[PDB]
Symmetry: C4
Subunit: 236 residues, 4 copies
């Protein structure tokens, strides 16, 4: 258990984390530069090796962090991320070559301020799941109806449940929903608007109400906590 | 009144509701699958019967639920929905064939968490009705003016009160409002912008103010309830 | 002063207001119907007279309301509106023929619930004026720069301060800002994005902050009022 | 130190500030007018001199304000702005000719109400910096992936990290994201949607959560301050 503390003091040291971050930033610049064909024609060889080096150092770092953290490591979402993303970069040189750039998100996992933002942002999601489920069901149903109503005459937009899903998502963002989709549809189906206006109403109303209910239920909790605090003093 | 309790204990049983939901989910998968011509060519016959079965079971379920709930059933919005949607699926094999997929919304009526979301979301609507009335009047008036101003030269977009309504709704979502509608209009009516900018201002200002007044009047009520609670202790 | 009370009791009577509203709604239907060339070919003559009648009754009503309310009438925004809108409908049979439909907004002036909505919605505006002034200055400045930078090569979108104003408003609503304006601009002015991205950032940031500051300064006032209430009891 | 107070009483006088503002507004009108080729053909000479005069007066004003405020001047963001913007207008008659119009923002620096708005609006930014950093990293990463995935076949939209950045910004504003970018992409890359839908989800979710967290953390502070106030009285 000597070498253990020895490594642990490295793995936990301020310097170690700083080094890794330094590499993250270095490699991030490198991956931008590798985007230029010009740059690659001249320095591609060097950069490719720098990637291999960084990826080796990260593998080593993951290995050390597992030895130090043991099981706790795989119960830690940030370390899992670091793990999965380094592992991707390990598969021998398709889509995976491009997914190697995901290692730059380690800058989030390695910077405490970033973690906190991401954690804060993510933390709202658990309470949204049933509204998401509801909307997903809503899309599913509409997608099925839209495939049946319009897929024969408008196969690109609705020929298939998946295409209908896609188009409905496009309608929800309001992108070209009328000039691009519903007006062409109405040239064959004069009542297409009876399908898409209500669809647009639900989806936009649900989105707004989701934002409203977050703010207001938040403040209600702030109000409750305050109330208890005030009540205690009055009680006391 | 024996058979009544007998049925009631079925209709109210955990298992019964679970079965029905199980069917809802089963049939939901089925209706997705029926979307593939491939899938239908092979298994269409089986699926069509599964639909008939599910629809029979649901009819039976509605009948039992009415016998058990009696009048209370038709005073219950969820049961009415379940009723209307199963009934649609009953009309003999137009639009109605597609509206059969609406039976998948029974997953909302049958899942308590879904009910609560939908109830919460719906509950804001009663207080919005006069703002909706106001906006509807606003559209109506603008639609009439737009038909008169532009319908002769731009019949597709404004030739008819209903087309003007449609286009105005499109303008409100901001979809291609300028490149698609107002710039072409301005090639004949240089002052078309004097009609649509203000229109855009009202409608977007009303939408935002509607969201603002929901949040803030909500918190004011939270503030009032808190105040009373605090005051009582101070009074006591 | 007898006939005065006599008229006043009419003008103030529940029935009188109800009659006028009844006409507003009647005439509103009529103006929709007059939108159909079919309908006009058959009943245009009758409708035209019904408009004249309604407009006469409204003139009479305004006259009575002035005699009853005297000066107070012209200090009342709703009555001024009713006045200006009936007056428009008086100018002998251009744009004015279409502005006659504005008389249907009297349904707002005559329905107390509508007044309250409109008053509530309008009431936020006084505090927005300096932000509006700021943004207007912002547009003005950008419009001038955009005219100078792009008006020679892109006259339709920027050839004139007014066209630049229009296009900038379009950019603010995000309507086709890239595919329709900035990408074409960038084919001649590769750095057009340095002008429009920041412009888009300011305008969207100002809009959001305007909404945020309304909600939060509202709640701060709600908080202050509550505080005082609670403090008094504690003081007492 | 006599002439110092002499000047200081000028530079600080109500009249001086009023004069400068008067010029700002005058020159603002002038710069609008200079936008018309017609207007310039007739009065361009006069206007050009009026610009030179105003710019001289402003230079003089800056010089006096520095003599009066000394070092404090260059520690003052508003004066720095006034400085930088007048200085631009000094470079001898490219882009700089157009940037001279930026001097009209001195109306903001010189009007206390405007300052306060701008200060209020700006004040939220310090707390947003890490979320901005996060998003910027997010764009950077996506931009790199999009360049690699799509730049060869779609060079205008993704051929270069900078073009990908631009397109991704366009996608974030939702402008033609589907009809204009992703549907064309999907004709070659059927799974392009797996890249852009999630991208759209993150960016819109982060934007909304940023607004939500501003409102709610604001109210939490309002709640805390109120609590302390109430607690003191109870304590007292
Ligand atoms: C509440 C959560 C709802 C979640 C719904 C998510 C479903 C997403 C399915 C997307 C399908 C994408 C594939 C596609 O579009 O084309 C494949 C075939 C038609 O093509 P093809 O077979 O070539 O003719 O089309 C099909 O493959 C039909 C796919 C049917 C699968 C349905 C499974 C969803 C279960 C949801 C059940 C809940 C209902 C109460
Ligand atoms: C607050 C409310 C937010 C909204 C909640 C969710 C709303 C629905 C989102 C739908 C997303 C759009 C899905 C989509 O684009 O289609 C994906 C596939 C279609 O696959 P495909 O057949 O390949 O067609 C793609 C187009 N094509 C033919 C030209 C290649 O079809 C599918 O299989 C996708 C089925 C839906 C899966 C995604 C829905 C659940 C994920 C929810 C995300 C929230 C997590 C934070
Ligand atoms: C809440 C959910 C609302 C869902 C209901 C949406 C109904 C409107 C959708 C729609 O327009 O579908 C059109 C169908 C199809 O028949 P239809 O529009 O009457 O014309 C078919 C023309 N032809 C011969 C070229 C095929 O028929 C109709 O829509 C007629 C109504
Ligand atoms: C405050 C709530 C306002 C609610 C307004 C909702 C009105 C929606 C009507 C939509 C009309 C759709 C039919 C359409 O556009 O074309 C039919 C004809 C013209 O076609 P055509 O006859 O073939 O020549 O055009 C017409 O049919 C003329 C339709 C006139 C009906 C007007 C009834 C609305 C009553 C609102 C009165 C309140 C005003 C104070
Ligand atoms: C918070 C504010 C939200 C906004 C409140 C409402 C704003 C106004 C919504 C207007 C909805 C758009 C209506 C529309 O698209 O036109 C429907 C018909 C026109 O029928 P049509 O003559 O068939 O023309 C359709 C286009 N065409 C010719 C190519 C087939 O013309 C009509 O007859 C429709 C008349 C209006 C009916 C809908 C307005 C009342 C429902 C409000 C929904 C709120 C409930 C939650
Ligand atoms: C802070 C509030 C700012 C409010 C700004 C509102 C100004 C709106 C002016 C819109 C001009 C529309 C007419 C137009 O675009 O074309 C007319 C000529 C060029 O055409 P042309 O003469 O035919 O060559 O172009 C012109 O007529 C030039 C117009 C110059 C008038 C400038 C008056 C605005 C005073 C704002 C001064 C505050 C600056 C500190
Ligand atoms: C919360 C922030 C909200 C934003 C605050 C205001 C932002 C700026 C709004 C600008 C509105 C757009 C103005 C516009 O479209 O151009 C109007 C004229 C141009 O006249 P024109 O030369 O006829 O060109 C029109 C296009 N054309 C050549 C094809 C016919 O050019 C002008 O003369 C208009 C000059 C601006 C006047 C409107 C700005 C002050 C009104 C603010 C409204 C708020 C009141 C609630
Ligand atoms: C905060 C406000 C920011 C305002 C600054 C915006 C600057 C970018 C706007 C822009 O792209 O204007 C382009 C100007 C014009 O010269 P330039 O873009 O260099 O090319 C002119 C090409 N030619 C020969 C066909 C005329 O020149 C340049 O922009 C070059 C930089
Ligand atoms: C967290 C903050 C992230 C901030 C990222 C901001 C980066 C913005 C760079 C925009 C590049 C614009 C120039 C461009 O697109 O084309 C130039 C070349 C390709 O053209 P070419 O060389 O002609 O082939 O393409 C290039 O020049 C490649 C540019 C690579 C520079 C990368 C520097 C960003 C450092 C961020 C490192 C953090 C990662 C953890
Ligand atoms: C609340 C979340 C808000 C979002 C936070 C930031 C999100 C990312 C914003 C990205 C802005 C878009 C940048 C952009 O359009 O590209 C600029 C250059 C590309 O240069 P370039 O190679 O010239 O290509 C331009 C297009 N072209 C080829 C046809 C001329 O590529 C670059 O070099 C730009 C690299 C990014 C710089 C801007 C990001 C940091 C500034 C954040 C602003 C917030 C301050 C309040
Ligand atoms: C309104 C719906 C549920 C509708 C049904 O019910 C959803 C929207 C997202 C959820 C909020 C977030 O999760 C953040 C936070 C979690 C706390 O734990 C409770 C407070 C708060 C604000 C949640 C309450 C909100 O209401 C939830 C239940
Ligand atoms: C501002 C306007 C009315 C304008 C006029 O007045 C509308 C917008 C929607 C309505 C709100 C929702 O109904 C939810 C909830 C119902 C409670 O009962 C009272 C509180 C709250 C937040 C309502 C107050 C809000 O103000 C209403 C009256
Ligand atoms: C933030 C800016 C001013 C920025 C500078 O300062 C603007 C935005 C619109 C204004 C609000 C509305 O007027 C409604 C209401 C009026 C009350 O009287 C005070 C409270 C409240 C919420 C106002 C405070 C808000 O802050 C104002 C001053
Ligand atoms: C949620 C994130 C941080 C996420 C991580 O953490 C960002 C969003 C913008 C920031 C707000 C603004 O700066 C205005 C104001 C400054 C005060 O000083 C504290 C309160 C308030 C409302 C800030 C708290 C908010 O939470 C910050 C930290």
């Amino acid at each position: 258990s000597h070498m253990y503390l020895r490594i642990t003091n490295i793995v936990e040291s301020s310097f170690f984390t700083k080094f890794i971050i330094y590499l993250i930033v270095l490699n991030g610049i490198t991956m931008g530069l590798e985007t230029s064909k010009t740059f690659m024609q001249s320095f591609g060889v060097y950069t490719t090796l720098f990637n291999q080096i960084v990826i080796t150092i990260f593998t080593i770092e993951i290995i050390l962090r597992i030895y130090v953290h043991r099981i706790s490591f795989f119960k830690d979402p940030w370390s899992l991320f670091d793990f999965f993303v380094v592992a991707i970069s390990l598969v021998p040189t398709e889509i995976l070559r491009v997914l190697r750039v995901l290692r730059l998100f380690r800058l989030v996992t390695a910077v405490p301020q970033m973690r906190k933002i991401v954690s804060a942002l993510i933390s709202v999601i658990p309470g949204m799941l049933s509204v998401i489920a509801l909307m997903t069901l809503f899309f599913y149903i509409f997608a099925i109806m839209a495939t049946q109503l319009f897929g024969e005459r408008f196969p690109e937009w609705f020929g298939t449940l998946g295409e209908s899903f896609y188009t409905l998502f496009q309608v929800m963002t309001l992108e070209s929903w009328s000039m691009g989709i519903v007006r062409p549809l109405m040239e064959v189906y004069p009542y297409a608007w009876v399908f898409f206006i209500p669809f647009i109403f639900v989806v936009s109303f649900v989105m707004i109400n989701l934002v409203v209910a977050i703010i207001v239920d938040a403040m209600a909790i702030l109000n409750q906590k305050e109330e208890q605090h005030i009540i205690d003093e009055v009680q006391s």
